[PDB]
Amino acid sequence: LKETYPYYLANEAVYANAELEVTDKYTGKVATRVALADASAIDAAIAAAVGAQKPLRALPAFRRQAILEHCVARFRERFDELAQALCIEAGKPINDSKGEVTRLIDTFRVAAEESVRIEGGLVNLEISPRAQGYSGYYKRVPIGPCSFISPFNFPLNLAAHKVAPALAAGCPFVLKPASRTPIGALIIGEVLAETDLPKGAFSILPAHRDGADLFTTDERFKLLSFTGSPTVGWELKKKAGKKKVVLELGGNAAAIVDADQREVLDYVVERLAFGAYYQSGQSCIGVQRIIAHADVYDALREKLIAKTRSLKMGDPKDPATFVGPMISESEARRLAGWMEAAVAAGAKIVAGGKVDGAMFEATLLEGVGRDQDLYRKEAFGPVALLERFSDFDDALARVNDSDFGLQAGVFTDSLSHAQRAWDELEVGGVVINDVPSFRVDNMPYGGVKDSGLGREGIRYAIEDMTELRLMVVRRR
Amino acid sequence: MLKETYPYYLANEAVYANAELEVTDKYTGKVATRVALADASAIDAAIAAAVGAQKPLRALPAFRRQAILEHCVARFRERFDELAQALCIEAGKPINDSKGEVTRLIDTFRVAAEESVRIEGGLVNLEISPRAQGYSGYYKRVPIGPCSFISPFNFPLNLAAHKVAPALAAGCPFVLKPASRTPIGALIIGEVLAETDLPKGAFSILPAHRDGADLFTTDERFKLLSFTGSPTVGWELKKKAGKKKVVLELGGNAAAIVDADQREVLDYVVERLAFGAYYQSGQSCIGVQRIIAHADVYDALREKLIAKTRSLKMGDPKDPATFVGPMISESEARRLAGWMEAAVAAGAKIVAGGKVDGAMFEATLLEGVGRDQDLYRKEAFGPVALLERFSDFDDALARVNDSDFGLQAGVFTDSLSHAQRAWDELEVGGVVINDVPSFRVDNMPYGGVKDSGLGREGIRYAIEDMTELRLMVVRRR
Amino acid sequence: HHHHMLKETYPYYLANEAVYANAELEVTDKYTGKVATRVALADASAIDAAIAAAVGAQKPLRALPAFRRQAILEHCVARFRERFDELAQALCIEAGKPINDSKGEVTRLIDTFRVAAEESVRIEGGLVNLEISPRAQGYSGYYKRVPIGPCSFISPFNFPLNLAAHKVAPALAAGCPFVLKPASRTPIGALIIGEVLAETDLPKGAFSILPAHRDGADLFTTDERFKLLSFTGSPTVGWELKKKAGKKKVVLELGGNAAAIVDADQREVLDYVVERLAFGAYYQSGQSCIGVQRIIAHADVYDALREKLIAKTRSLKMGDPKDPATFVGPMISESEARRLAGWMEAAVAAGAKIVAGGKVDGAMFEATLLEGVGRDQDLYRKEAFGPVALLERFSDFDDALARVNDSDFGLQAGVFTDSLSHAQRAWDELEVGGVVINDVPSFRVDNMPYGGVKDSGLGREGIRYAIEDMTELRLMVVRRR
Amino acid sequence: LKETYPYYLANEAVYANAELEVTDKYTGKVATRVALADASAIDAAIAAAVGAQKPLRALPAFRRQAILEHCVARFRERFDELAQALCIEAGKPINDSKGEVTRLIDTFRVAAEESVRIEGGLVNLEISPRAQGYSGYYKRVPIGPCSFISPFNFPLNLAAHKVAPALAAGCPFVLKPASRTPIGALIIGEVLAETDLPKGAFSILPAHRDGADLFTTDERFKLLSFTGSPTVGWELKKKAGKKKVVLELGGNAAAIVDADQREVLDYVVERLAFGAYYQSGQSCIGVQRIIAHADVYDALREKLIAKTRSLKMGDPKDPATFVGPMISESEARRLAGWMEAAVAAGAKIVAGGKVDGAMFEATLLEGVGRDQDLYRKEAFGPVALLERFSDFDDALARVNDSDFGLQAGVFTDSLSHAQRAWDELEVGGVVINDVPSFRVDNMPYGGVKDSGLGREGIRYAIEDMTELRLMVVRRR
Ligand SMILES: *[C@@H]1C=CN([C@@H]2O[C@H](COP(=O)(O)OP(=O)(O)OC[C@H]3O[C@@H](n4cnc5c(N)ncnc54)[C@H](OP(=O)(O)O)[C@@H]3O)[C@@H](O)[C@H]2O)C=C1C(N)=O
Ligand SMILES: *[C@@H]1C=CN([C@@H]2O[C@H](COP(=O)(O)OP(=O)(O)OC[C@H]3O[C@@H](n4cnc5c(N)ncnc54)[C@H](OP(=O)(O)O)[C@@H]3O)[C@@H](O)[C@H]2O)C=C1C(N)=O
Ligand SMILES: [Cl-]
Ligand SMILES: [Cl-]
Ligand SMILES: [Cl-]
Ligand SMILES: [Cl-]
């Protein structure tokens, strides 16, 4: 890592200060220092984004594509640097960190392809005699300056899912990364600064939530796009004013294991362990609830206990580590408190369960009451809950027994069960024969209920960052 | 003649709960009918019924929803004169234009009947990288949930239709609050819907005054608020909406450019300008408020427009000869008259019309209105238009955009390049070429940017906001 | 409501108007053999005149706005509903089609025109971003669909209303003038449609409907003024017509020997499966281009399915198609029944066994079920087009898929299964136009893409897809500097 | 150039013989020798294509994309080699040759992007009570083995418009390039041979038209896609048998100059000279007929005579050459015979007109009667005809006064004239404010009337190389 990082104000690196300390989430020592933006800098960034609307809009589509393709090439060259920085600032196991840099590249690559493909349309207006001679044409224009707020757990790829569409769509933006994990955003900033984007087209400004009011309230932003916790996101919607609001939040995702799965339980168990425990459960679609049919429950339980106990916890820089530290000791203590309450109420820890500082073991529980915080709130840690069902409709009801609705998974070979799950699960996406934790970066992605408002995935984010501009032409 | 009293509709059924809401004839000023006024207990009951109707409504196949919409079309056609006359009374809308809106009401439900059997689904290729080998993606649209609908006084039928008909096509239960000044049209829509086999709770139509309507914005069981009305109200309701999606269809001060090449078609242009500026006495969210005309045609356009404006017949909207009926109230005529007087005091000149008697506001044309005047920058929503002159097309575009609003604009031109530039640079929802900004057909994407709205109506586009994508990812190994 | 009688003579339609040119074409009641009516037979001079009028109608027809074409289509819908019984009874007589299934086809006629009425106001155009490289900076693309030109339509005897409708109704939606030649054995329905179409304000020359025997129909294939030949009929004829079509686009809707797979997991729903198999195999005496000809049933359910299917097949009433109790009416002619009976006799001679039905009397062919038909037999590999189905047994699902594909044809196949992976494998591996899951391949709804691959067709019908073939893209590139 | 080139049989270089001599079209000397495929080799290629169907269909989309991206990267590496080979075997001026190599890269680039977004669909089938419970899904599958025939004038890019879609769609193909210009196609074959396409996925086989019968008649091909002269194309359609036929032919394209174009006449004349005389008019959308309004006719005529005379004719290896040799002396004699006939009937040569062997000057004529061969047949040489109009409907009627209908151009600033041109010109494509000679490689491209049947451009070609495969699912 560099000794200091700047922030990016109107496309240019500014070593304004070194007030924001970023710690190695495993050793707790300060790893680097970056410049912290104050309100005057955020205001300057917004002013410059307003000024860049017209130059940015004049860029032809192939120039936007070229800019995105430059990012792709440089992320490829700097692949291991990006992964190592992610490993340090997020505590993310090095193999998962490489997974994320691969996705970062995927996301920018899809955006490069979509930048020359933005949907326009023709509409037939001659639907009645009054409208004889009229024809309709629409194209998508930038919504205007965008305010982007990203979280700690995928500090490259979840920032990418706003930055890359904005570049494809021609919106200037100001991005506030997570203060705990700002480095990846600032490496994206350095790469973007090398392109011929108009000055003001982007700023990337670290700022604590307590100094971030302008990202929500400033009327010069036309879009607020927030990825993070449900409690924060719904509060920001209340204060956004006139701008459009897109929310990517979290949930307590469930995976159903159907009665017909005996012969493939080793496959199911492997995916369940990945979904529940990769990057230590700190995924908005991490597996938290496992709803297993009575016919397979016993063999699944035995296999899942074994697999869970086998996952190495420790130094995320070690390729053998599967379970790194949680983002902070305080977050481990929150989850450990929910776990202890669940246990005192009758639940049993059947694998794992030890917590030391931010080091939370991969843990499996049985008998968690559905009214427990551990069941109903977002665990965001390496805990999974196993329950048993015999009626498939009851399994669906259990998945839906939640404030949230991001993604769900169903392991089944029953056509009608897959159909019924698609129809009845009140989630953004249903995954068949994999865990809810699966995402590919072109697919529409987001939540309903308390889990979000809108869809990301390149094409869908561009939709929200643009406005239809209709032309009606009358011929006489 | 109207019925002596109208019910409201609670969970698909007529309830003559009371007769508290008096509806006046906007021309005679006398009470024309009385209708049932919903209290908060009735609105709460309607919301609970809508929640309960979600699953039965979702269970209806598309062809059943189409049959429900087609029944509405047939009954609206059947009751065409009844609807137009009620509209004429409760809105003071000239009878020919009332008949025009009933025709649009039919069109809107007809488009929705067609769209109900072709709601968009999709396939997604997910095999974009080795990690995703063997995955395929399918998505369909599901109802967003119970919808809260608020409609205004000026197009009570068609602007309610642009929410109700999409909701029927999409399978969303809804609760509609019509404007208290003009609730009869919506209650006739309710009577027609009550004839269909929609599940109970699929719809409620509840008159309520704004000060009793808090739940339409704040109740957490609604998943969408779709509001059509004044910008001042709409942006305030967005602040209080909570978690729900918000769609806003508001107003503006729409402009029309007349280009330098228009000499040979000026009679056509003037006719459309007068229609746009003075149709239903300017009470249109895309009424022509500002006319920006090139110096080359300005003198001939001015003479023709003054003559046309002075020819428009004002009076009893029940008279088919009437083009300018009453404004919705004397207080609204007084509002606009005050801006007009302030503009004249600052140097503007009335060149046609200008006389106001109660709610009877003449079709009025001004020159010399300063760009900083309330008459220029605020939504007139009355039979007043402002004429100004330009010579540089970019100046004309800048003048169109010199506004808080951005709903629609119009450009009369035969220059390909000027049309291209207008489409590119006018910050509006829609640009109309060779007709006024006041044109709308009910299938087109329709809405505003800047302070004029958030989102699009028109059947397909409304369905899109009333539904959520539900993705299915399937892994084969 | 009432028993109708056919008119004594029917005209043909030349440039939208009835011409009682002659009464040379006798149309028989296919059950009684008796001549039912006579219609005007068009000669080559009349065909040429219709083609010339179609050319002349292109510009007027192009000038109709979309809502006018919708109103024309809606008029047909309204009148087909008014004349529902007239159409069903005429269909019953001229095609020998059981009256309940004739009513079913008139319902499809209505649905097909209704879908076309809806599609007529939403014909797709598009925008194209052309700024993909520095050279193309400032260019933008717009495209709309325009009529392909005059269309030649040829339709068969078995679904004479609805298969004509799948060409006529898209042509009206797309704005193509057309000349329709119906099957000489079943021209009445097409001419009733012509009468209804004559009532509309279509420009003169927008349509002609001309009965003509195949030996006098050469211009329908070869005339250079037609820009599209769309043929629905036998594979042998269709592929030959393509060879003689010349420059025009060619669309073919042909036949096949459709198969239905019954998977191992279907025991609890066998009564439903048997009902659909019997419907698919024997509806209109198997004279359907997607009739079930081959049933491929898993060993786990085979014995139970076989007993239920034999009983269901035996229960089917054969007789006068005017009798509403009749499900199996006459085949279209005695010679066609003799063709199929000979293939059946050859299959039995090589070891097959008739396990239900099998009696043939003139054109009255019993609903018949066979076991043990060899895969090399004509009865297996050629289009039966009669009330015969063949039952075979499998255990390996890949072997079942290979058996479905073991064919010159590829129109539709059906699979009864609750296995997600089997449905996916079937979708992926069956070389057919359409795979039906948990119903027979005989299912069709008139908006869906429909057609064959291999020897079963070229192109797709279903309203939206037919419109696409009857139109050309017209691109506009606009350069701004 | 290499001394000898192989052909490609089932993805492999085969030095079967050196029988096909390829000449330098300017010097006339033999430049190289290539292997000539006989009927046995064509048969083996077709058999190998049938065998490759299932392995090729098994490739996931991202693998097809990587194969196409490999081609793009290698064409960039071999850019000068491709351009010089084109300049020799086609006699194409070197700057025009580098232009075509750039297009070759564009075409493959677009195909790589489209390979991962081939359209499928959902259809709502519940349109009547009979169809309650049914749902529709469709995807596109390869049509099968494709027969490709390409012409001499754009040897690289017009072959690319068949090859690249086939790779994106998963169809095996056998390509027969033009015998006069096969080197480009064989360099493409060498690059394709480097990839992990299954053996049999592609063959590229030089063969003279007289030995090419199997490319039209073999029933194992499911598609014939031909680009070349109208006379050959319509003949091949008649012999194609059951296979689908796609035809990209030619025409006598027209450009209208409207009455309002005085202020931009230098631009108009520049584009006219480009469209009429680039690669010596040997383009299927070369400008052959110029229809100019009386109001600007005299000023355009003067500027166009001066422009045409300024164009340097000579050695195509010299970058200063704009007008290289025509493909053969006999093709020059053909065009010069039509020119002499039109002059004998009263036309006047007003610029150029000199022909020496295959060196045909950029030439402009007036007064060519509309019944002349020079007017109605495809000139395919550096000759353009100027005529005059006053009524816009007359100008439209003149454009349509042809057997052909590929593209037309209209220089106008009249909105209504542009709308009318779009509506009434019976062509595949109308170009507004550029010549009909414009093409970008993603746009739908093709002719109506005698000019073609079907559309190329990557997305549109893929549509013709695939079949819809519908799945109807009944739930009860
Ligand atoms: C996919 C992956 C994860 N998630 C959801 O993310 C959170 C876990 O992330 P976390 O960073 O801990 O969430 P957060 O809400 O606390 O902070 C996110 C960003 O918002 C900033 N922020 C907080 N509060 C404010 C206020 N008042 N104003 C402005 N900005 C604010 C944070 O600032 P810092 O102080 O941390 O710098 C930070 O930038 C889980 O809930 C998980 O579900 C969602 C995913 C998805 N759906 O795509
Ligand atoms: C864009 C550019 C050009 N064109 C159209 O192309 C021709 C000029 O090209 P040309 O090679 O001279 O045309 P062609 O028809 O003579 O030959 C083209 C290819 O077809 C092969 N070929 C001819 N005849 C047969 C037969 N009977 N069987 C098989 N193959 C045959 C030729 O073989 P060679 O003997 O030359 O090796 C050659 O491969 C102009 O009309 C021009 O308009 C079209 C374009 C477009 N629309 O995309
Ligand atoms: Cl109308
Ligand atoms: Cl990967
Ligand atoms: Cl370029
Ligand atoms: Cl039905």
Short mmCIF file of C-alpha atoms and ligand atoms in Angstrom, two decimals, chain C residues 107 111, chain D residues 128-131, ligand 6:
data_model
loop_
_atom_site.label_atom_id
_atom_site.label_comp_id
_atom_site.label_asym_id
_atom_site.label_seq_id
_atom_site.Cartn_x
_atom_site.Cartn_y
_atom_site.Cartn_z
CA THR C 107 -63.20 -19.75 -31.88
CA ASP C 111 -58.76 -15.34 -31.52
CA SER D 128 -58.09 -17.19 -23.81
CA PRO D 129 -59.69 -19.58 -21.29
CA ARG D 130 -58.39 -22.56 -23.29
CA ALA D 131 -54.83 -21.32 -22.64
CL CL E 6 -60.84 -20.37 -25.47
#
